[PDB]
Design a protein around this nucleic acid. Structure first.
Ligand code: MG
Ligand code: MG
Ligand code: MG
Ligand code: MG
Ligand code: MG
Length: 127
RNA sequence: AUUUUGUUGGUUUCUAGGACCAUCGUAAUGAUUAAUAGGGACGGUCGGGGGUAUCAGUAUUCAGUUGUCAGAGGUGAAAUU
């Protein structure tokens, strides 16, 4: 029936990656980041830039034959935040509205089972 | 050792007092509770109590292979990178 890729969306609080691979993930089909759509660093992670990034990904996906994708959303994870960035919700909605078909959706944020020391010091970063 | 038998002094048994030694007889013969103090034992437990080994887990970083291609990072905004 459909031809599935995997839309690996990495939405941090400084950028948004829309990366579509095959099922294995060893073959990259399209990787458009929110920073390729704006000329200001402060909104590389904006919802607007993620939507534009996803639309360019969907157009590239169509001409290769990818008709559906699975979604693997992730945040920065590790010792840093586990909540997804603001661009991850827009890139997901843009892909669904671009004619691409959606399969399984999963959060694949890396989560430690403890962990290493997190940056900032004992008193945190004082603002 | 007072006292003799007094004519004065020697003799060692009764004697009395210890002080002990054995036997026998008397006797209701002789050991306070177990502290809602403690200690100890014992019986099933219960704990992220300790020590010595041992076995996970993802994460972080670094490296190897792969894939694409222009940015990535970081911030209130940036720049160093
Ligand atoms: Mg400092
Ligand atoms: Mg303050
Ligand atoms: Mg008692
Ligand atoms: Mg015991
Ligand atoms: Mg019980």
């Amino acid at each position: 029936s459909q031809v599935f890729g995997v839309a690996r969306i990495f939405a941090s609080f400084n950028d948004t990656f829309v990366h579509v691979t095959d099922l294995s993930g060893k073959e990259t089909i399209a990787r458009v980041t929110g920073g390729m759509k704006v000329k200001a660093d402060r909104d590389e992670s904006s919802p607007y830039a993620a939507m534009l990034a996803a639309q360019d990904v969907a157009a590239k996906c169509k001409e290769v034959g990818i008709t559906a994708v699975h979604i693997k959303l992730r945040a920065t994870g590790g010792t840093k935040t586990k909540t997804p960035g603001p661009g991850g919700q827009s890139a997901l909605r843009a892909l669904a509205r671009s004619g691409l078909r959606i399969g399984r959706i999963e959060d694949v944020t890396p989560v430690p089972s403890x962990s290493t020391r997190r940056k900032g010091g004992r008193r945190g970063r004082r603002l």
